[PDB]
Ligand binder design. Structure first.
Ligand SMILES: [Au+]
Ligand SMILES: [Au+]
Ligand SMILES: [Au+]
Ligand SMILES: [Au+]
Ligand SMILES: [Au+]
Ligand SMILES: [Au+]
Ligand SMILES: [Au+]
Ligand SMILES: [Au+]
Ligand SMILES: [Au+]
Ligand SMILES: [Au+]
Ligand SMILES: [Au+]
Ligand SMILES: [Au+]
Ligand SMILES: [Au+]
Ligand SMILES: [Au+]
Ligand SMILES: [Au+]
Ligand SMILES: [Au+]
Ligand SMILES: [Au+]
Ligand SMILES: [Au+]
Ligand SMILES: [Au+]
Ligand SMILES: [Au+]
Ligand SMILES: [Au+]
Ligand SMILES: [Au+]
Ligand SMILES: [Au+]
Ligand SMILES: [Au+]
Ligand SMILES: [Au+]
Ligand SMILES: [Au+]
Ligand SMILES: [Au+]
Ligand SMILES: [Au+]
Ligand SMILES: [Au+]
Ligand SMILES: [Au+]
Ligand SMILES: [Au+]
Ligand SMILES: [Au+]
Ligand SMILES: [Au+]
Ligand SMILES: [Au+]
Ligand SMILES: [Au+]
Ligand SMILES: [Au+]
Ligand SMILES: [Au+]
Ligand SMILES: [Au+]
Ligand SMILES: [Au+]
Ligand SMILES: [Au+]
Ligand SMILES: [Au+]
Ligand SMILES: [Au+]
Ligand SMILES: [Au+]
Ligand SMILES: [Au+]
Ligand SMILES: [Au+]
Ligand SMILES: [Au+]
Ligand SMILES: [Au+]
Ligand SMILES: [Au+]
Ligand SMILES: [Cl-]
Ligand SMILES: [Cl-]
Ligand SMILES: [Cl-]
Ligand SMILES: [Cl-]
Ligand code: NA
Ligand code: NA
Ligand code: NA
Ligand code: NA
Lengths: 171, 171, 171, 171
């Protein structure tokens, strides 16, 4: 490569894996969003929340690909694994699955920082800081806030709570 | 002092103590507001209500300091005691703590009027009338209204009531 | 905590201490600002400079608290120590006290970076970079510039110099 | 009188005396303002400051007269004594004379509150609160601030200080 400078093969491979995780997360959120659009589930605000996350994870993948090319790395695409469930249960079940997924992305980001730090690659570290580390923390906080409100609303009338959360928080 | 006129040392000291109470109230409301921002509490409207009160109590302290200087008194700052709790329980527990705090400020204001009246200091009495006595009564009425609505919403489904109050009153 | 990830108890405690330092700095600047509003000191531009810094340090504390909650840490408030003086002397004395205070905050920020680096916490390091390290350097440079101009203006006519600095720099 | 109610002859007389003090203060400020317009004094900002105060004291007299008529009292005008000096010395001498005059008005206002309180006349007390007590405190604070700045500027070059104060504060 004519442009590549201070860009380890280890970072290049890790960036390709992270693209694959972001795209699988996008696909998962696509599945979650259509599940909540089913006529027998019918929680529009839950569909909107997950379809917006599908878009944000795709954007994360696009950003990582653009950065791979800017550094002289080579994008390599793998199979995208189907999402872990076909049916996602309650809003609560789905928001718990989403926070597990987000913590796994966050761990992949922290693991890529550790690799970039070991490889002395400050451009990579700046890239993760600028577009990923804070966005992921902000999203996990919001999902935690959602899980607390959903859990509060379960009590004894679970249908009522699920309706009210969708109507008054996911508006 | 070249400007001081009809301004008792007793009033001067009482004004400094009242600044300390308003600043401690501001600090308490800061603590209450961040408690309701915790991911395991997550009541945004409750956070907004208390952070707005932190701002209003700071404004009260600033007004008292400005008046101290206008009369030729000397501002003296003491330690600000940490708030009375680290964790504030339910919205109900927190609004009860806030109305106790407000009644204690109101009593300090009435005590300062009594001192100003005994010292024949009509400028002080006009100052309290203009910026404090009515604002405190209006705030305590609002907190009473809130406590009545929260209490009505407890019934048997406490989580549901706490969510609905935050969503539909503290909007 | 449902959200906490890669957030050391050591960082959590250090963040709470830093909130306490920012709030004590805010309180110090409140004291400095009202001292310069005294009828026997009467330097309006000096009052405005310090009251603006009281606001900026409070903002620093609020930002640190918001970040504590975003990471799943728990805000813990301590007593706020009264400022180090009741009377602050000349503009020069006050700007020297302010630069000592600012260097002590800056050292606390650098100490928190060192802890975050030792704990491999890149989100913390990004947070300090984004809202604190450059703001503190920019402020200390401005205070140095002020101290140089004040020192130049002392010569033999100290009252004249103090008036002119307040009128023509702190405008 | 068809309208008079709860309006003591003692208050009525005190209001007429206070009109006479406000008008004499207006006349004094007229004298001060023209002195600073003399070609051999020539401090335009000092002239503007005192002529504005002549206008404000006249407004005070007009307000007291309007209130006398609203209560069914009878305005009685006396001779207006010429001002205490023909020549007013330095800006410092003049601002010292102005703060003495203002403290004497303020004492007359406090004395009228004491009389109104003894006569159980809450309308009078509200009138003084609304238009006089705070305005007088705010003015005496400003004059104190001015005296501090003038005193700072004397040092060894009194002409230079007097010029700079007029140019940069009384702008
Ligand atoms: Au959807
Ligand atoms: Au949707
Ligand atoms: Au969709
Ligand atoms: Au996409
Ligand atoms: Au996309
Ligand atoms: Au994409
Ligand atoms: Au794309
Ligand atoms: Au890194
Ligand atoms: Au790095
Ligand atoms: Au969520
Ligand atoms: Au959610
Ligand atoms: Au949401
Ligand atoms: Au808040
Ligand atoms: Au809030
Ligand atoms: Au807040
Ligand atoms: Au404040
Ligand atoms: Au404030
Ligand atoms: Au304040
Ligand atoms: Au303030
Ligand atoms: Au009173
Ligand atoms: Au009074
Ligand atoms: Au309330
Ligand atoms: Au409330
Ligand atoms: Au409310
Ligand atoms: Au100030
Ligand atoms: Au100021
Ligand atoms: Au201020
Ligand atoms: Au603040
Ligand atoms: Au603030
Ligand atoms: Au703050
Ligand atoms: Au704040
Ligand atoms: Au760091
Ligand atoms: Au770090
Ligand atoms: Au400075
Ligand atoms: Au400065
Ligand atoms: Au400046
Ligand atoms: Au004039
Ligand atoms: Au004039
Ligand atoms: Au004039
Ligand atoms: Au007039
Ligand atoms: Au007039
Ligand atoms: Au008049
Ligand atoms: Au008139
Ligand atoms: Au009165
Ligand atoms: Au009265
Ligand atoms: Au003045
Ligand atoms: Au003056
Ligand atoms: Au002035
Ligand atoms: Cl599979
Ligand atoms: Cl304590
Ligand atoms: Cl101490
Ligand atoms: Cl005479
Ligand atoms: Na290199
Ligand atoms: Na008096
Ligand atoms: Na971790
Ligand atoms: Na009567």
């Amino acid at each position: 490569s004519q442009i590549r400078q201070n860009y380890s093969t280890e970072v290049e491979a890790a960036v390709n894996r992270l693209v694959n995780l972001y795209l699988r997360a996008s696909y998962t959120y696509l599945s979650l969003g259509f599940y909540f659009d089913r006529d027998d589930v019918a929680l529009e605000g839950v569909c909107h929340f997950f379809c917006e996350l599908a878009c944000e994870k795709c954007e994360g993948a696009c950003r990582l690909l653009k950065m791979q090319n800017q550094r002289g790395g080579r994008a390599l695409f793998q199979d995208l694994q189907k999402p872990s469930q076909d049916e996602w249960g309650t809003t609560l079940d789905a928001m718990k699955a989403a926070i597990v997924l987000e913590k796994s992305l966050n761990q992949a980001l922290l693991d890529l920082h550790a690799l970039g730090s070991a490889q002395a690659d400050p451009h990579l570290c700046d890239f993760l800081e600028s577009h990923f580390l804070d966005e992921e923390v902000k999203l996990i906080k919001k999902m935690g806030d959602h899980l607390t409100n959903i859990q509060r609303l379960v009590g004894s009338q679970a249908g009522l709570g699920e309706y009210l959360f969708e109507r008054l928080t996911l508006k």
